Design a protein around this ligand. Structure first.
Ligand SMILES: [Mg+2]
Ligand SMILES: [Mg+2]
Ligand SMILES: [Mg+2]
Ligand SMILES: [Mg+2]
Ligand SMILES: [Mg+2]
Ligand SMILES: [Mg+2]
Ligand SMILES: [Mg+2]
Ligand SMILES: [Mg+2]
Ligand SMILES: [Mg+2]
Ligand SMILES: [Mg+2]
Ligand SMILES: [Mg+2]
Ligand SMILES: [Mg+2]
Ligand SMILES: [Mg+2]
Ligand SMILES: [Mg+2]
Ligand SMILES: [Mg+2]
Ligand SMILES: [Mg+2]
Ligand SMILES: [Mg+2]
Ligand SMILES: [Mg+2]
Ligand SMILES: [Mg+2]
Ligand SMILES: [Mg+2]
Lengths: 39, 138, 113, 181, 261
RNA sequence: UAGGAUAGGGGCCUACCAUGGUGGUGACGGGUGACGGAGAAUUAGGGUUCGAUUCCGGAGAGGGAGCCUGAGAAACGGCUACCACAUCCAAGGAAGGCAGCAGGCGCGCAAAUUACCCAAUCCUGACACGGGGAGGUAGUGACAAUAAAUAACAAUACCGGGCGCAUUAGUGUCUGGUAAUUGGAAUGAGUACAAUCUAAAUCCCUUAACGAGGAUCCAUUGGAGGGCAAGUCUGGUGCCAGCAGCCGCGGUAAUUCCAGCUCCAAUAGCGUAUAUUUAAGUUGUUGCAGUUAAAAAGCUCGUAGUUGGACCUUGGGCCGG
């Protein structure tokens, strides 16, 4: 019971970037289509 | 071999009624002991924890799986229940109000945790995944 | 530039009205108000009294420009008084409504006498 | 309590084996090549095909001159011909089994817009459908799975209100115009 | 339960009433009357749902309380009256007569008739037996009781009744070879000529009937109804002359009506 | 058998008499977290499991019991008595029955408004007018189900594969994208004049003017060893924390934990738990197996049960397509 939270506290805190959103829905299947086997 | 007379419907129906009992699933499902288990035919069960315990892990592994002894408000059973997240045990505290659910394998011990069939899915009325993900603190 | 055509039209001189489904075609226009339908439908049928009319249950179809509804040409406003539900006379201003408060309306009144 | 009595059901079914490369990439082939919103639309198409093929299979099980066979065989065949989903000289009640999900996907209104032009892209076709830009006879349709019949196929055309084929210019037009003026 | 059931729910309603499913919770619940009340139509169904002279319960109430709607020679203001087979429904203000008959698909049409074939009705008899002081009387399936019956009129037969003399003018003897039309079951609506009648001791009597164009069928006695002697009916048949046509044939009718225009 | 009672048959009950009725084809008894059915889920076929619930039938109104009125009640939004519970009392007394609608407590894993309305569907009354928490309308409602947005199109670009010669080039066609790159178009989410809807409002359907620069009008759920689709990425931890349905990972180079990038499957949905169907030809009548994997009784007799050899003219013709 002494060692609870050990590693999850050991890990450093880091933050995301501010990624541009990927398209949702139809446009997302579009990018999948014309990225897998159109390119 | 089988009995296949055109008039043997009574024998075949009695024989299947008699021989379905050797099937484990049918026996478990109709024997009536599922109402004598702790949940007694319930999916979840709100209970009160007695203490954060921590227990050994089985031979190939070696670790301390952090469980808790909970009492069932509904029928007084005292059981052991796991806490399924990293360092999540701290959120639990003595005599808190938790929701205990089946831990998988349908009422049968899971993985390397010895003889524990239950998992904590809520505490003090707050989602425990939310506690893990800082979405909402109790 | 909106037109007005009526079908499923039937006369009932049991209740002496002229009952029909109207299928107004109103392109561009959002929808045509019933108060404005009244005088057009009056001036096409020559009813001599644009108040016997009562029109109700409009839809304004998906995509717009085309609307359905019911129309009831009464011949005598007396007939339209007797043979009509109260609510749409109240709508066209020919009757008025009163508000209820149901306590003592019957219950504690049933106790004294 | 009435309105309990209004029936309703399911239209697709999630596939049996979730993670298969063959089926996954075949379905991506179809979804990308018809520009669909997701694979729910595709699964509705296999569901409708499964329904019609079950009916046709049961009909073919029986023998001819059986009035039940003839009646809904003819009903199913005229349904197919109204949707133009079978060609001429092809009414045999087996070419109903022969057809596949490509046939249904080819009748959807997005596809028909694409094949009649007026889109410059199939995804552009879908959007034009959903911004009320297209009518069929006189009624503007915004459901890209509209399943046009051939008797409506000939005159699928723009609305009388869309800026492209109808009346007044759109709000972007009128903002640019009023700030220019 | 503890008494008569006074509400009827739309799904529980007879299937030949045609009335829809989301139209409400309850159905008109035809009152106790002179006809079997599962084989009947309320005058509310006659008015609102078929002729559409009104649009609501209350407007049909206005219709009936005006005393216009006259049935079988006398006005009936009840709004759940069980009007049924060859009841004649007249309206003086429209001067318009109707007679209620089965159509071939098992439902009820209101066939217009002129005044001469609306001055009278036609019904079958339930049974003829004696009464007080030995005066014979007969009972019809319309419920009517007629005293001093013609010594030849027997059970299961058919009788015409005017609405002024209010008695018998003539009668069809239910026998082999007279045109009938079944009034219940899956064969209801179809007119036809009785071609055979076999009796089995202690059970329903079976009637084998042939339609006007070849088809043959069978029926129980309580369902058949002689109309006229021989092939000729004594009543104006509906637009289908009592021939139920197979679904393929009726598809061909609509296909031909399409290709004729 | 005779009678009594019932509206009426009847051991329903009484008097007398007889010694009968059910059962291995399962009575009687016990369990049922059991109201029955129409039906629900799943289904190649056959099946398996469920069915409190809006349709029909039955039964109850806290638990039993007994009756008035009435055509209809052993009624409970009727009464009488007892038992359990409880309210007012000025302390003698009195009123009770939400498993009706709404709402409150408790029980729990578990379930909404103390709303409006008689306009519809019908019922009801002495009755065209009254009444109707039946029933409808509205508020909460990711129970389930349906359609379905979250961008589209153009040239610019470092570029990226042929196609015009294809060498030696170079730029070329659908544009593939890292492009907050550049650009004007399209619109509904939302706001909202109005009208329509409505018993009156509200929603939907129409539509004055407003309403998109990509940071926003921002899509999540779970997963990235095998099954099983997707990292022999990077940092941290070091048989610990923890993961993991199972096999397994972690003992200082972790594809498995905690994190970031990337990616994947589904997508306004998905994970989790239990129960159940499929898988299951692991309940097998269709359709399993018994030498050795679990399973031929030690052996024979044996009643029910199941199963039972062959044999009986439509033998040859006409006739109509
Ligand atoms: Mg098993
Ligand atoms: Mg192990
Ligand atoms: Mg009842
Ligand atoms: Mg007796
Ligand atoms: Mg029970
Ligand atoms: Mg019931
Ligand atoms: Mg009761
Ligand atoms: Mg009682
Ligand atoms: Mg009550
Ligand atoms: Mg309640
Ligand atoms: Mg994630
Ligand atoms: Mg993870
Ligand atoms: Mg990871
Ligand atoms: Mg893989
Ligand atoms: Mg897991
Ligand atoms: Mg894993
Ligand atoms: Mg086996
Ligand atoms: Mg062995
Ligand atoms: Mg042996
Ligand atoms: Mg034997």
């Amino acid at each position: 019971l002494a060692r609870a939270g050990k590693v999850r506290g050991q890990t450093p805190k880091v933050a995301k970037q501010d990624k541009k959103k990927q398209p949702r829905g139809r446009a997302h299947k579009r990018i999948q289509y014309n990225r897998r086997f159109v390119t | 071999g089988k009995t296949r007379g055109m008039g043997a419907g009574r024998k075949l129906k009695t024989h299947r009624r008699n021989q379905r009992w050797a099937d484990k699933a049918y026996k478990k499902s109709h024997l009536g002991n599922e109402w004598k288990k702790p949940f007694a035919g319930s999916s979840h069960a709100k209970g009160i924890v007695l203490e954060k315990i921590g227990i050994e892990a089985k031979q190939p592994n070696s670790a301390i799986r952090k469980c808790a002894r909970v009492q069932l408000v509904k029928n007084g059973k005292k059981i052991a229940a796991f806490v399924p997240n990293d360092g999540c045990l701290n959120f639990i505290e003595e005599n808190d109000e938790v929701l205990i659910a089946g831990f998988g394998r349908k009422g049968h011990a899971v993985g390397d945790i010895p003889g524990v069939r239950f998992k904590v899915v809520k505490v003090s009325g707050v989602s425990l995944l939310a506690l893990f993900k800082e979405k909402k603190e109790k | 530039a909106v037109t007005l055509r009526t079908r499923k039209f039937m006369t009932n001189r049991l209740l002496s009205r002229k009952q029909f489904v109207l299928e107004v075609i109103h392109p561009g226009r959002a929808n045509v108000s019933k108060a404005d339908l009244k005088e057009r439908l009056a001036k096409i049928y020559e009813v001599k009294d644009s108040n016997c009319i009562f029109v109700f249950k409009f839809r304004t179809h998906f995509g717009g420009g085309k609307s359905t509804g019911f129309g009831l040409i009464y011949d005598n406003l007396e007939a339209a008084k007797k043979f009509e539900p109260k609510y749409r006379l109240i709508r066209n201003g020919l009757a008025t409504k009163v508000e209820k408060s149901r306590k003592q309306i019957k219950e504690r009144k049933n106790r004294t006498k | 309590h009435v309105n309990f009595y209004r029936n309703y059901g399911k239209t697709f079914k999630k596939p049996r084996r979730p993670y298969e490369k063959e089926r996954l990439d075949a379905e991506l082939k179809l979804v990308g090549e018809y520009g669909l919103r997701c694979k729910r639309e595709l699964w509705r198409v296999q569901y409708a095909l499964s329904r019609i093929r079950n009916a046709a299979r049961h009909l073919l099980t029986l023998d001819e001159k059986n009035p039940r066979r003839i009646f809904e065989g003819a009903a199913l065949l005229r349904r197919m011909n109204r949707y133009g989903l079978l060609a001429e000289g092809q009414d045999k009640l087996d070419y109903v089994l022969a057809l596949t999900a490509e046939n249904f996907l080819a009748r959807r209104l997005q596809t028909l817009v694409f094949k009649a032009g007026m889109a410059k892209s199939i995804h552009h076709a879908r959007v034009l459908i959903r911004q009320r830009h297209i009518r069929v006879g006189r009624q503007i349709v915004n459901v890209p799975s509209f399943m046009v019949r051939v008797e409506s196929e000939k005159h699928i055309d723009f609305s009388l209100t869309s800026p492209f084929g109808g009346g007044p210019a759109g709000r972007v037009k009128r903002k640019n115009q009023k700030k220019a003026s | 339960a503890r008494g008569l059931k006074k509400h009827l729910k739309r799904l529980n309603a007879p299937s030949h009433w045609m009335l829809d499913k989301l139209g409400g919770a309850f159905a008109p619940k035809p009152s106790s009357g002179p006809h079997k009340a599962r084989e009947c139509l309320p005058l509310i169904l006659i008015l609102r749902n078929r002729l559409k002279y009104a649009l609501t319960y209350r407007e049909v109430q206005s219709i009936l309380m005006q005393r216009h709607i006259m049935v079988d020679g006398k006005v009936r203001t009840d709004k759940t009256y069980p009007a049924g087979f060859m009841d004649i429904i007249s309206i003086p203000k429209t001067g318009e007569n109707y007679r209620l008959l089965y159509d071939t698909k098992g439902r009820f049409r209101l066939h217009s008739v002129r005044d001469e074939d609306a001055k009278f009705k036609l019904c079958k008899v339930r049974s003829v037996q004696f009464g007080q002081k030995g005066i014979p009387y007969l009972n019809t399936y319309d419920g009517r009781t007629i005293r001093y019956p013609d010594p030849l009129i027997k059970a299961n037969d058919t009788i015409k009744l005017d609405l002024e003399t209010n008695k018998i003018v003539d009668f069809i003897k239910f026998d082999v070879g007279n045109v009938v039309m079944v009034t219940g079951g899956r064969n209801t609506g179809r007119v036809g000529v009785i071609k055979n009648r076999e009796k089995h001791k202690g059970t329903f009597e079976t009637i084998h009937v042939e339609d006007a164009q070849g088809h043959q069928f069978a029926t129980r006695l309580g369902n058949v109804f002689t109309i006229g002697k021989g092939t000729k009916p004594w009543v104006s048949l509906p637009k289908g002359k009592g021939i139920k046509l197979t679904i393929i044939e009726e598809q061909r009718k609509r296909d031909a009506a399409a290709q004729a225009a």
